[model samples]
Target: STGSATTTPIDSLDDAYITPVQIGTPAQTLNLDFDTGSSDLWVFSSETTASEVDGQTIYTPSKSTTAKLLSGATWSISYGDGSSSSGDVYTDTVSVGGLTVTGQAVESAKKVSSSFTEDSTIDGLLGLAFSTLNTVSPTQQKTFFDNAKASLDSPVFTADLGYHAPGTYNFGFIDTTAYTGSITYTAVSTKQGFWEWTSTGYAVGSGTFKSTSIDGIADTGTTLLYLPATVVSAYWAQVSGAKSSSSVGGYVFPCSATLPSFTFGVGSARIVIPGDYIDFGPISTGSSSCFGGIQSSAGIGINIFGDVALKAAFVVFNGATTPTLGFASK
Candidate 1:
């Protein structure tokens, strides 16, 4: 915990995005992120047509000493943001840490218009958030877990949300000692591909967010943290002179002060979002850049935790172990 309470930073890479750690005999590089809305492991390349992409960064598999492209299957995906990209499907060598996998399912999308591209500087997209939403069939899908589970020291995967500190979230290697063991379990919601939950009121810096009851979802693919309008507005309203312009964005407060500690009651479990959790950005917009931990998205389909939040600790997605989800040390 960074503060007196628990914290999951906002995924600043257009909500939240994590690049996969590409491990191979010679080792390779892959951008990784968790996406609940859709599924597929696709990357852009130098050979991609100029017309096929806009704003999105494209990765050249050709750049990787061991990269390869899927021959017969070409694929394209369109995000809810209106941006799109397409690429040829290919099987190649993908390695993360000590785990090396071959003939792994991957898509190379050349087009992407998601706001994250123009919002900041990044390399590519990694959709480790979920396997079913991906383009892989049960028979063809080769998730990071699918490839590494057998070789892992244990049946677990952990991600560090080091986004708040610097650089980017670290990938690979499970250090399970960081977990509390008795972690709560949440079933995967397939209807919308998002893992949603319900919670009571939230506490921040010893202060409460008015009502204690609310429901929300967690998604890795999304690049931003989301909260209901009530909570969002109430949070700013409580912080002295904080203000929000419909023309601007959500809560906007002075960036000089540290955030207060926060906790949300989730069923029987009380999840805390530390004071430092909301500290984020590629900080811009003006000399008065705002540090956002919570944003308004009452209607946003997916409330993504992305890499910003994932960096907080190690996470386990055990589709094999009773189809349950859990978290451990980073």
Candidate 2:
């Protein structure tokens, strides 16, 4: 990560945004992808009005009435998921919901791809995960929050993901009312949001456990709430009436009627996935039963609870402070 996107952080380190916030004022709009997996805010620029990459989004600064380049710096970001983008610096007065932070420096990618293109409604991604994973140049990594920490009256940058379930992504805060109490947070890992401190292993529907231990990192970016083979199989056995099925990786149990409730224990923090959140999206009418959560990754080594898992509790990404995680409902 010598030249990675998270080097500089913020010159002030007071919880600020490095990429320009607003480009052409109010009437102008610049679409982009703000990712939490990484702290980079990039957009496909109008420069590639012709060479459009399939399935990705593009941000045209020309549309913005208040856009500017970031000190003539060129930037590029590669994600852990193998997606990459590069672009020139641009400034804009970007506004998320009601919070408005001006003078933000953002990367305007010239090229585009399907990942960005597929989600036509998503203006762009706003990443609030950690400072290290930020896609900004290593020299200026800290990102929007780390840099402008002093200016923030609240000082804490929390992402609530709103209400959408995957496909439709959202960010910012969620009202703390229905849960129980104030939100609890865990310090993030220096290794980014991977939750290296305590990820015991995954167990799906039930049975024999896989050797794929140490699957660090719990992400909210994914769906289905997948797990490794062994862990998944072991959990399947716990189901009220587990039945084997090959369509969904074998370890999956069909017990739509007898689906057993499963839970994960990480230290004292325990979260039980609501059967509703765990239910498979849409299935055939009479398949004996459907698996709520599945073991989708046998070849993989990570177990991300995903949006469904995170939906059960309030997730806090405390990277700038200590990179820890804390869960609370109220």
Candidate 3:
């Protein structure tokens, strides 16, 4: 059967989307970050140190009759932001929305870094990227989507992400009503374990489109948009009082700046990001300083179209063939 679910944003922070996932027998509901950038289904569990768990919910394997330890199997993950977690493995039934995958590998975290432990609201992460990115040792793990895809009506999922608002994710079918106009699809190169593509070019404000191609990844887990240093520099130059700060790790600008909307080329479609969206958020509360949603992708090499860019459209991650990406205005 086809499956779907609504993604909820934690009230005060527009940085991430949480999906309600149920794992094991008798089902334990956990609010998990549905990240497409990485692959590994892990949870803050009974194995986690109590002091480190803080306000997060814990998954108890002992309480679930169906949960079984995967002997000698373990997982360790380090995120780009230096967030990390390490744990042993378990095999259990996991369900996303109405899609159930039995004998799914579940990583039970015994330790987490400050970045992860401090995120008390998230019980775990439900990675949506390819299974190849799974960190389990001895034997790699398949993502819930990878295990469930074969049974779906069509091996596709649509992501409708929003800013400071709730969005929906649909599996096995595309919801045409969720988007406007037409959907523009581009081929995805997944050799790197991500939904990577090359944009024909981009334009700043109402300027002419540049012909330079940019290779980037569509990352739902990342919060801000990131392009090459040259592109970021060009865009920041258009805004008054905008300056790059090594201390802040990106570009900062005056809160009152009249930011210009930017567009990226996707085949013939020009996906637009509104001007105000460039003004990500204030540097600090009660401060007139703001950070640009777009940043430099210097050492990273691959540009990243994070939430700030994805939320402006309805995206479809098509895994049927070569794993193409479809985009449309929301």
Candidate 4:
């Protein structure tokens, strides 16, 4: 069996992707952030404090006949951005697109950070990373993808993210028509609990390709592309009036500047990101400066190929015995 679903960006900035998910027996639908960085399928629920609930939908486990409490089980997770949530665990029927998984562990949020409450666009997150990253205590739980893989015709999923538009997430099989040319496959290192891989190199616009390897994670949850300082600085240097500003928190340039395209290699395949995409958006509502989608990852520990890069291609997360990633131009 296989399933497919459409994911939409919540805001004009393409901040995050949200997919509709059905949970419980009668099926309560919630817009969940399909995050590939973490491994916990948690949601705002009846157990969440009323004050913390700000217009977001809450899952009511009591209303579902098939919902069963996972005795003494609890989970807590924090992101690099300092936002966090903690909750108790429950096993219930969860379905994505048309793929259904019975007895899926659903973490019900009892508490959430201010950032989460402030952004009411997402009720929770559906983690697609490896299950080893799950935050559930005592016994870790598997992610929706992990549990549904066995039932799928092919134990794989693909992400086709769009810019300020709706994208599709396909489970089980890849849609050959969705991408152009053959896919370039690369081995994934799951040791860090992320879809981590090494890129052959990068090039700024139509410049010569640099034949150096850069390690990074393909994270849909992240908003920008973070690369080594040397790589980031080189890209920004090509733009007129571009500078790293502490106040703006990253590289910002005149919105009127002609931005250069970014290209990263997957083996010999080069995925080119249009210059307009790198412009990101204006720093402020009426500001003349715009933030660069590509930034330095000096303090971040690991480089991250976030949505800014992911949106350029069709990515496949293959879940065979030895996991591998496939990238193709779209």
Clashes of each: 40, 93, 0, 0
Which has the better lDDT: candidate 1, or candidate 3? 3
lDDT per residue, candidate 2, 46-100, as tens digits?
6643545443344567767778766657667665455556767776765543345
Once fitted onto the true fold, the runs of candidate 4 whose alpha carbons sit more than 4 angstroms away are none
Q: lDDT for model 2, on a 0 to 1 scale?
A: 0.49
Per-residue lDDT over 1-330 for candidate 3, one digit per residue giving the tens place of the 0 to 100 score: 678889887654467888898898899988899888999999999999877888888889998999999999999999887799999999899888898889999899999998778777789998888888999998998988888889999999888887778998888899889999999999898888998988889999999999888899989888888999889999999999999988877899999899998888888888889887677678889879888999988887679998888888899999886799999997
C-alpha TM-score for every candidate: 0.73, 0.68, 0.97, 0.99
- Determine the backbone clash count of candidate 2: 93
For 1-330, candidate 4 gives per-residue lDDT tens digits of 888999999999898989999999899999999998999999999999899999899999999999999999999999987999999999999998999999999999999999999999999999999999999999999999999989899999999999889999999999999999999999899999999999999999889999999999999999899999999999999999999999999999999999899999999999999988887789989999899999999998999999999999999999999999999999
Q: Model 3: which residue pairs collide?
A: none
Tell how far residue 281 is off in model 4, in angstroms.
1.6
Ranking by TM-score: 4, 3, 1, 2
Computed on alpha carbons, the lDDT of every model, listed in order, comes to: 0.52, 0.49, 0.88, 0.95
lDDT of predicted model 1: 0.52
Point to the candidate with the largest TM-score: 4
TM-score of 1: 0.73
lDDT of 4: 0.95
lDDT of 1 by residue, 195-293 (tens): 554455666567744456555555555555576776667666656546665555556667665666555554455555555666654246554556566
Task: Give candidate 3 misplaced runs (Cα > 4 Å).
Answer: 11-13
Question: Candidate 1: lDDT of 315?
Answer: 52
